[PDB]
Amino acid sequence: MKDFTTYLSTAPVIATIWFTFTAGLLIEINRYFPDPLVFSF
Amino acid sequence: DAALPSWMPGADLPGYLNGTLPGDFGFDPLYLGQDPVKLKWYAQAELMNARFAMLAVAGILVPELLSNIGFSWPGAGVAWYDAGKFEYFAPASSLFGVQMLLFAWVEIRRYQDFVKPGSANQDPIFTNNKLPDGNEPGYPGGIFDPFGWSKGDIKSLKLKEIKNGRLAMLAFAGFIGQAYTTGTTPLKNLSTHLADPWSTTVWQNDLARL
Amino acid sequence: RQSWLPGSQIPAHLDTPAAQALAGNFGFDPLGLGKDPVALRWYQQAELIHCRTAMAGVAGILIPGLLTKAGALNVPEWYDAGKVAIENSFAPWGSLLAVQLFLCGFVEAKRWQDIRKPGSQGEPGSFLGFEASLKGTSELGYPGGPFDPLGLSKEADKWADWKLKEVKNGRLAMLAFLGFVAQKYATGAGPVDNLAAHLKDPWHVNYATNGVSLP
Amino acid sequence: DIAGLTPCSESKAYAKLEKKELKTLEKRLKQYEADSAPAVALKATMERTKARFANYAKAGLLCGNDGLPHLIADPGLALKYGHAGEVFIPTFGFLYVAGYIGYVGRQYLIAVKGEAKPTDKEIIIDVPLATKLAWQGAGWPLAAVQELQRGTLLEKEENITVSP
Amino acid sequence: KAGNWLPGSDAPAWLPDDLPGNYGFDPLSLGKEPASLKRFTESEVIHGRWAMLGVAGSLAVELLGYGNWYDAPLWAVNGGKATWFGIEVPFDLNALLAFEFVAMAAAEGQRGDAGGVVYPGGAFDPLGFAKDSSKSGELKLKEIKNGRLAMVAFLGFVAQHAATGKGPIAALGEHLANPWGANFATNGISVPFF
Ligand code: CLA
Numbered sequence: 001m002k003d004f005t006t007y008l009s010t011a012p013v014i015a016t017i018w019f020t021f022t023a024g025l026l027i028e029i030n031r032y033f034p035d036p037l038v039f040s041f
Numbered sequence: 042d043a044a045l046p047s048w049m050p051g052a053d054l055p056g057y058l059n060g061t062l063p064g065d066f067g068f069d070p071l072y073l074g075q076d077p078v079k080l081k082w083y084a085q086a087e088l089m090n091a092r093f094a095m096l097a098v099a100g101i102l103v104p105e106l107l108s109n110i111g112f113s114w115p116g117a118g119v120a121w122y123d124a125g126k127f128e129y130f131a132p133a134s135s136l137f138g139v140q141m142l143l144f145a146w147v148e149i150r151r152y153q154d155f156v157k158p159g160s161a162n163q164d165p166i167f168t169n170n171k172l173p174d175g176n177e178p179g180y181p182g183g184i185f186d187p188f189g190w191s192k193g194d195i196k197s198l199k200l201k202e203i204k205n206g207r208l209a210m211l212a213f214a215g216f217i218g219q220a221y222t223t224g225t226t227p228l229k230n231l232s233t234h235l236a237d238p239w240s241t242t243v244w245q246n247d248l249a250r251l
Numbered sequence: 252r253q254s255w256l257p258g259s260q261i262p263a264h265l266d267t268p269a270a271q272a273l274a275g276n277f278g279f280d281p282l283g284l285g286k287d288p289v290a291l292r293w294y295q296q297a298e299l300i301h302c303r304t305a306m307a308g309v310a311g312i313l314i315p316g317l318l319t320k321a322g323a324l325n326v327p328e329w330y331d332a333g334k335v336a337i338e339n340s341f342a343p344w345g346s347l348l349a350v351q352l353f354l355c356g357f358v359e360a361k362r363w364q365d366i367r368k369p370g371s372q373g374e375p376g377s378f379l380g381f382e383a384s385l386k387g388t389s390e391l392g393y394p395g396g397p398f399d400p401l402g403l404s405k406e407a408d409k410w411a412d413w414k415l416k417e418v419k420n421g422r423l424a425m426l427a428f429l430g431f432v433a434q435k436y437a438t439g440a441g442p443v444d445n446l447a448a449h450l451k452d453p454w455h456v457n458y459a460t461n462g463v464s465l466p
Numbered sequence: 467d468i469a470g471l472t473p474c475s476e477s478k479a480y481a482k483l484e485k486k487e488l489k490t491l492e493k494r495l496k497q498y499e500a501d502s503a504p505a506v507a508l509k510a511t512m513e514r515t516k517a518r519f520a521n522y523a524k525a526g527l528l529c530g531n532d533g534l535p536h537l538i539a540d541p542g543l544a545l546k547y548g549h550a551g552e553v554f555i556p557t558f559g560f561l562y563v564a565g566y567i568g569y570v571g572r573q574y575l576i577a578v579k580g581e582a583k584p585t586d587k588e589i590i591i592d593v594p595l596a597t598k599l600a601w602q603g604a605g606w607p608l609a610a611v612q613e614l615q616r617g618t619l620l621e622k623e624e625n626i627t628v629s630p
Numbered sequence: 631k632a633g634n635w636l637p638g639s640d641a642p643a644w645l646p647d648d649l650p651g652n653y654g655f656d657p658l659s660l661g662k663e664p665a666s667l668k669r670f671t672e673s674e675v676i677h678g679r680w681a682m683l684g685v686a687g688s689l690a691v692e693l694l695g696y697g698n699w700y701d702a703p704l705w706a707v708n709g710g711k712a713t714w715f716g717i718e719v720p721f722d723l724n725a726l727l728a729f730e731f732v733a734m735a736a737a738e739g740q741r742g743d744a745g746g747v748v749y750p751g752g753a754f755d756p757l758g759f760a761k762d763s764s765k766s767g768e769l770k771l772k773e774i775k776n777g778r779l780a781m782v783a784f785l786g787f788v789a790q791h792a793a794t795g796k797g798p799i800a801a802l803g804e805h806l807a808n809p810w811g812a813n814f815a816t817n818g819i820s821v822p823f824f
Pocket residue numbers: 026029030034035036037038
């Protein structure tokens with residue numbers, strides 16, 4: 001599956017994994033920390 | 042790494058404790074003295090902590106021995122951990138300052154012979170008195186040996202000094218840990234362990250204190 | 252070479268002879284911050300001074316802290332010694348910080364110029380005869396001269412011992428100050444008070460009994 | 467009150483707008499059974515709403531005549547009056563991540579230029595090289611100023627022009 | 631040479647043996663370069679001169695009974711009427727401040743940047759002692775010794791007044807009165823705990 005891992009390392013597959021990662025990071029943040037308009041403490 | 046006496050007879054010894062240092066048995070399981078420039082400092086430190094601990098045990102037991110026998114001292118029966126509160130002809134600050142000036146003389150005189158041996162054996166003000174040349178650091182001799190010892194069988198005497206000194210360092214650590222738990226005189230701990238030796242071990246005092 | 256992880260490939264710029272002969276090199280740079288050799292030369296200075304100021308600060312926290320909890324001092328908490336000692340003070344804090352930044356900037360800019368070019372402050376005619384003892388040693392970060400009064404540098408043996416003792420006590424004190432700040436934020440008590448609270452109940456009073464290891 | 471404004475914990479249009487949103491949620495809630503699944507989500511929306519108003523009034527945001535929080539985007543009016551978390555703290559919390567990505571992509575380009583053919587590792591990204599540069603790019607401003615002091619951040623007039 | 635300051639220790643190479651007041655005492659290598667040693671051999675003598683004059687002035691006020699060295703510049707605040715041998719001085723602060731700024735600079739700048747001399751023969755020896763034949767270095771050694779002791783004495787004056795708030799004689803009498811309760815340790819300053 002070395003060719004399958006080179007397919008997993010192509011541009012749109014990395015794009016759709018990394019954008020789901022950076023989407024579902026910010027989404028879990030806005031679940032556990034609702035409505036951040038201002039930098040609080 | 043020879044037929045030397047050993048702390049554990051049979052095991053290997055790391056080899057740098059051959060017998061040149063007085064009263065060695067190869068006991069260094071943490072391997073501290075690998076660099077010999079640390080080992081020389083550790084030898085002088087064991088001599089100094091040992092001689093002050095021998096003076097400590099002789100100055101803790103003997104006042105308590107003559108207190109429990111009973112003389113008429115101004116300080117008699119006072120604890121060694123309570124002699125600081127006891128008042129004297131001067132308050133303790135002047136005592137500490139005189140101490141930290143006299144030992145500031147003596148310790149630097151000793152340290153200059155540590156960093157260059159044989160180079161402090163002449164007085165400042167009376168430049169005719171001297172210690173005899175050929176002494177090692179830790180053992181000055183001369184006026185520090187007024188009774189004519191160390192003129193034969195010096196290795197056995199150094200081994201006696203370091204054995205009594207290691208025993209007295211353990212005794213002073215005992216004085217600390219055995220005056221901090223039960224809070225009594227260290228001779229009145231021997232009195233209780235001779236009153237009933239079985240009904241007061243360290244374990245029963247620990248479990249009663251727990 | 253006694254690495255921080257025994258099985259890791261040490262970064263190759265921490266295995267150069269310039270970097271292996273450096274104080275406290277345990278092969279620890281997992282984020283590649285010193286890959287340029289002059290970046291490493293700058294950050295070695297930054298580590299020495301972040302660690303010496305931390306050793307001075309952590310000593311000034313826990314030596315009077317342990318001498319407060321054992322009596323014969325009444326030094327307050329380190330997070331309270333700015334609130335107090337401004338009343339027992341000849342000056343307010345603003346003038347004091349201004350004098351502080353002048354007296355410290357005169358030192359720190361001379362150190363800046365010595366790091367950017369070694370032996371800079373030793374050129375004659377700078378001070379009034381004092382500049383001759385300001386070349387430092389052959390390596391930067393360890394000046395000596397007036398900064399070694401007891402004379403522990405005139406050995407050339409056990410010198411890496413003194414270097415590594417300074418670096419390890421300094422890294423431990425930097426972790427201790429990051430501690431002091433964090434164990435203040437977490438429970439609002441003092442550091443020796445937190446040590447007593449851990450030593451009276453270790454298995455229940457720790458950083459798993461507050462809101463900072465939260466699931 | 468910096469520029470004709472008012473604290474949101476002081477203004478009444480802010481509290482009136484909170485009561486307006488809670489009134490809409492309440493008249494929306496009045497249709498359902500009290501323990502059903504829509505009513506739980508509506509009360510959770512009310513709880514998030516009230517927590518949002520409490521934490522906007524707590525941080526000292528400035529309301530206007532409209533009753534809406536405002537952002538003072540000037541240091542020296544945010545640092546002096548305690549509004550640095552509005553713009554002045556996230557204007558570096560952004561730029562750390564911006565220069566982070568701009569440094570990671572820069573180093574991924576420069577570390578793939580000197581190969582056999584670079585373009586194949588731009589449509590097919592070398593993932594261990596990418597994750598190595600992702601982790602070790604954490605100190606990017608440090609490495610950026612150390613690269614600027616060389617002149618290895620810029621390139622000289624070896625660049626490609628037309629006809630000056 | 632004539633002295634070793636810590637016996638057994640070696641003398642540094644950058645201290646000349648014919649130099650007056652030599653002991654080898656330079657643990658910082660602070661005068662290693664010869665230009666810095668030439669500046670410091672001039673400045674130590676002048677610190678010793680002005681400290682001998684300072685300790686003589688700080689002791690003669692109390693041995694003549696006119697307050698101390700500390701409160702002698704205390705008329706400029708809370709009143710006036712400075713004295714000297716009991717004789718009044720009708721001068722305010724700014725006039726004598728300007729006279730000390732001007733009339734001393736006309737001798738200091740005449741001394742300093744007109745060379746680097748520290749023992750000028752001629753008018754500064756009216757009686758005649760230093761003909762530089764045989765008794766030059768002996769008198770220079772006595773001057774250095776007495777001046778170093780005077781610098782130590784004035785730093786002791788400063789620390790003694792900063793710790794006890796008294797004068798030199800006013801606490802030398804207490805050290806002679808209670809020798810074991812009137813030293814540098816019974817105050818709560820110099821020794822922090824005991
Ligand atoms: C450039 C224009 C712009 C700006 C400045 C903003 C600004 C904002 N928007 Mg907005 N928005 C915009 C355009 C913009 N938006 C557009 C175009 C839309 C339509 C798509 C929206 C739709 C929108 C919605 C629907 C919401 C916002 C929200 C917000 C707030 C952000 C709260 C948040 O998510 O915190 C994020 C805070 C962080 C600290 C994230 C940083 C990430 C981590 C913590 C740092 C990294 C840590 C670690 C190293 C990561 C691990 C790495 C991993 C590999 C292990 C903020 C006021 C939210 C809000 O509350 O409104 C006020 C909200 O609900 N916006």
